[PDB]
Structure formats: C-alpha cells, structure tokens
UniProtKB/Swiss-Prot annotation, chain B:
One cellular-component annotation, GO: cytosol
Function according to Swiss-Prot or TrEMBL: Catalyzes the transmethylation of nonepinephrine (noradrenaline) to form epinephrine (adrenaline), using S-adenosyl-L-methionine as the methyl donor. Other substrates include phenylethanolamine and octopamine. Also methylates normetanephrine.
GO MF terms held by the record: phenylethanolamine N-methyltransferase activity
Organism: Homo sapiens (Human)
Gene Ontology biological process terms from the UniProt entry: catecholamine biosynthetic process; epinephrine biosynthetic process; methylation
Protein name as catalogued: Phenylethanolamine N-methyltransferase
EC code: 2.1.1.28
Chain sites annotated for binding octopamine: E196, D244
Record keywords: Catecholamine biosynthesis, Methyltransferase, Phosphoprotein, S-adenosyl-L-methionine, Transferase
Length: 268, 257
C-alpha cells in the first residue's frame, strides 16, 4: 500500500516531542536508578558491555541510529570505535546532544550512567575518562530519517559503509506498523558493511509513550517479530534477549511490557 | 599539640583530598593506591567482626569505605571538635558537607561487586553509630565510660599517630595506647606518612615525626602485633605540593597476638 500517510503522521507527532520531559521520563529515577541491579538501566548497560567485551564487535566507524537526546547507548561502544556518528530526526534532540558535547551545565547529566558503565566494564576506568573519550569520538551529529531509502540522505558526511550500527528505541517508535518497521530496518541496514554488526534495543508490546505534551504512537512488536525482521533484512541473530518490565517500573509514561536487546551480524 | 587548635578541616581536606592528590582517575596516584590496600585487605575475608573503631578520623571517611561492609557497628573518633562537626555534616548529609563521592565511586570500582556508590555511602552512614572525642596520648584514649563497644574487633587509623607524636618514643606509646582498645586476635589497619616532618592545615602548621617503613614495622612488633602486610607508596614529584614534605605513604595490616 502507501507508506507516505503513516510517515506523515509520525513526523507530525514528533514536532511535539520534548527532549527534557523524555529524558526525565526514561533516564531519571525510577527508571534511571542504576543502584538496583534488577532494573532496566543496569540490564541495558550490561547487554551492551558484555557484547563489546567479546571483542567481536569492532572496527573504525560506528553509527548510532535515532540517538535522540541520549548517549548511554554509546558508553561501552566508544572504546571500540574511533569514529562515531550520532543521528536524530529532530533538531531539538541534536541540540540537546550539542549541549552535552560542549560539556555545558545546562546539559543532561549522564555521569551515573558513565560511572555504572565503568563499573561493569571492570577496567577501573573513571567516568570522567569514559565521558571524555565519547566526546572525542563523536565526529558528527546528523539529521536522519529511517523511512527514506537513504536514511542519511545522498552524499552525506558519514563514512559509509559503517562497521557497526547501534539503535535504541527508534524503529518501533517511528513505525506505524510492522511493515513500516521492516522497511525502516532494511533502510538502515544499507548503511552497514557486510559482516558488520548491529546492536538493537527496543520496547516490546508497546503502543504509546509520553514526551511532554506529545503522546506518541508505537507499533507493538514481539520478540519473534523482531527476530523475523532481522532475518528478513539479512542478519544472523547472534543474541536476542528480553527484559520483562517490573510492575513498579510501569509508571504511566508508556505501556511498555518489556525491552529486547538484539545482537545481529549482517550476512556478507 | 596546641598547634592542633589552629587546625582548619576545610583547608586540610582541600590540601590532601582535592586535586591533584584527590584526583582518582590516574591509578598510579596515592588516593587509588590507598583505597586498594584497604579493599584488597578486607577482600581477604580475614578481617571481620561486629565492631570497629577509626582512630583519629579527622574530617575524612574514605578510610572506612571498604571497611563498612564487614562491621555493623562503627565508631569514628577525633581529638578536635571541629573535625567531629565536619564528619557529622557528611554523616547527616547536612549542608556544606565535603563531597566524598569520587572516593565512594572508586571504592565500588575497586571492590568490583557492581555496587553503586550511593549504596556504599548509605551503608557507611548507617553503620557509623557514633563520633567520639579521643586522645591517643592517654593510656585510655577513649576515657573511662565510653559508649564505644570494647574491646573492638578491629582498628583503623590513617595519618594520626606520626602526626601527633613529637618523636619515635611518643609514637610507640600512642600505638600501645590504642592497642589496648583492640581485642586479642583483632586486626589493625594503619596508614601514614613516611619520613614526613610537617604539614599545613590553614593557619595551623603541624609537626610530624619522620618515620621509616622498618621503624613502623618494629613499632608494631613491640606493641604485640604480627605484621601481616606492610607496603610503601613512594610519593611522585607531581604529588609534592607545598602542603607538606611527605616522602611516601605506608600501609600496614597488623594482627594483635
Ligand atoms: N523518521 C525518523 N527517523 C529516525 N529517527 C526518528 C525518526 N522520527 C523520530 N525519530 C527519533 O526517534 C527517537 C526515538 S526515542 C529514542 C532515543 C534514544 N535512542 C534512546 O535510546 O532513548 C526520537 O529521538 C525521535 O526524534
Ligand atoms: N592527641 C590526639 N589524639 C588523637 N587524634 C589527634 C590527636 N591530636 C590531633 N589528632 C588528630 O589527628 C588527625 C591527623 S590528620 C588524619 C585525618 C584522617 N584520618 C586522614 O586519614 O586524613 C587530626 O584530625 C587531628 O585532629
Ligand atoms: N525510550 C525508552 N523507552 C523505554 C522503555 C523502557 C526503558 C527505557 O530505558 C526506555 N527508553
Ligand atoms: N594527612 C595526609 N593525608 C594524605 C593523603 C595522601 C598523601 C598524603 O601525604 C597525606 N597526608
């Protein structure tokens, strides 16, 4: 059928996306409490840390797809990639990342995430060093639209193809349905070299979340749907794990039921 | 001694626990070295019990970071009221407290139990039952009817004895004095300046007895200790700051036998 109408709804909805509210809802406590090892924050960081710890995910260039105003997803990654591209649809998110890169006080504070990353990576690294490295390795912050066949546009800055991709809570949150999801997955997969790796994190069985005024629509997906989409896009699934959101982390900022983390290698 | 009546806790903290000496990023620094001696010792699981006393705490808490998870009853001490007030400010999370969070974080980092620094500080604050006045120069340093559970299962002291003793003999006696507080079989963890003769604390200028590693060893033996571990950290040039003339730092793990 027609993809344009659905995409236009999404783009419209995100014009009301408020980065601060979003940061507060997802990365401040209770969800942003990293003290409980059973929490979602620690689980995510652990998936990322353990994956990079295999040494199997490395190279020169990495691209973060739909970064938003967050950086936690790149904390463990930055030690393995000299060149990191961050990306987002919204200018206001790109600016938010701009505040953090300039180490402004106005910026969101990721230090609890940085510290927790250093802690689980087990190298005795101090968080200030972790943060300094990330800031050094982010070579550009780019506009992106995963719905376009060339999500970064034509003749764009990013070194292509990238050795690896990271994406957290993007696809399912900008895709009106499973078919749009699959197409978005196919588009970003063009940015990854063959043999490259994708690290994918997202909400399971979610239909909405709040970002200030904006109550945005999410395509509820299942683990098996995520798995099939990855296979469909030409990936071997190396790892796919599920975190079940505990009742007390269900706070009415969304209707998420769980979080998935996928490690996939693009067949080449 | 009367010199300690000019001792400024904020200036002391600033001089020794703010950068450069307070920068914990470089693993080769003295801060990380100290935390490591503490951490590694307790990790052995051989230094355990219910009660512990920190001798001459001053306005600092780093020395108990790893210790607090092995002892449910912790007593902190210092000769100066101003230091006891400063500790309380951090213990009660009052305003103007010193920020020990960099130290808490590195303790968690070093211990490697994936503990968050807020939990660490929470546990310490919880287990410190009391902050008592003390004079190591007295044969009963805590006094007659001290609220402190005696004898203690273990003792900790950092940069005290050598810093309040005019000379080696005085040093030795102060060690004998505190040793009476320690249950036989108990453990003492002792940290201090090596070959130091003075250090500043704002308007106060304190005299120190310059001691060597083997001098410390001998003193522990004489006091009735078996020396389990004794290590030295040589002070790098960039950590020589004009606030003292320390040459090194020692760590001793001693068991009362
Ligand atoms: N068409 C599109 N293509 C790529 N990203 C889009 C997009 N439309 C919206 N987005 C972005 O999708 C993001 C989802 S929120 C996820 C933020 C971040 N990655 C984290 O892990 O929390 C928002 O930043 C939003 O601006
Ligand atoms: N007669 C005495 N008996 C016990 N402590 C004394 C003392 N005279 C001075 N002190 C204290 O000894 C401390 C030395 S500085 C050490 C402070 C802290 N333990 C640290 O590791 O940094 C000061 O706090 C000082 O007030
Ligand atoms: N965007 C986003 N949605 C989430 C749902 C659960 C936990 C998280 O950290 C999330 N981040
Ligand atoms: N009192 C005191 N605390 C110290 C910490 C590190 C190095 C030193 O020389 C110190 N002296």
């Amino acid at each position: 059928p027609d993809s344009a109408p659905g995409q236009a709804a999404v783009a419209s909805a995100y014009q009301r996306f408020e980065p601060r509210a979003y940061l507060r809802n997802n990365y401040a406590p209770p969800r942003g409490d990293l003290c409980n090892p059973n929490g979602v924050g620690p689980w995510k960081l652990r998936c990322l840390a353990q994956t990079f710890a295999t040494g199997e995910v490395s190279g020169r260039t990495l691209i973060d797809i739909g970064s938003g105003p967050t950086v936690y997803q790149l904390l463990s990654a930055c030690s393995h990639f000299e060149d990191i591209t961050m990306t987002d649809f919204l200018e206001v998110n790109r600016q938010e990342l701009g505040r953090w890169l300039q180490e402004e006080p106005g910026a969101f504070n990721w230090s609890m995430y940085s510290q927790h990353a250093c802690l689980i990576e087990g190298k005795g690294e101090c968080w200030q060093d972790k943060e300094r490295q990330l800031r050094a390795r982010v070579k550009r912050v780019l506009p992106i639209d995963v719905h376009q066949p060339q999500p970064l546009g034509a003749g764009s800055p990013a070194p292509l193809p990238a050795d690896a991709l990271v994406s957290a809570f993007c696809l399912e949150a900008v895709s009106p349905d499973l078919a749009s999801f699959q197409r978005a997955l196919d588009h970003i997969t063009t940015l990854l070299r063959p043999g490259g790796h994708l690290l994918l994190i997202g909400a399971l069985e979610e239909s909405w979340y709040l970002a200030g005024e904006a109550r945005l629509t999410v395509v509820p997906v299942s683990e098996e749907e995520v798995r099939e989409a990855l296979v469909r896009s030409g990936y071997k699934v190396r790892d796919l794990r599920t975190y079940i959101m505990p009742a007390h982390l269900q706070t009415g900022v969304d209707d998420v039921k769980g979080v998935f983390f996928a490690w996939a290698q693009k067949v080449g």
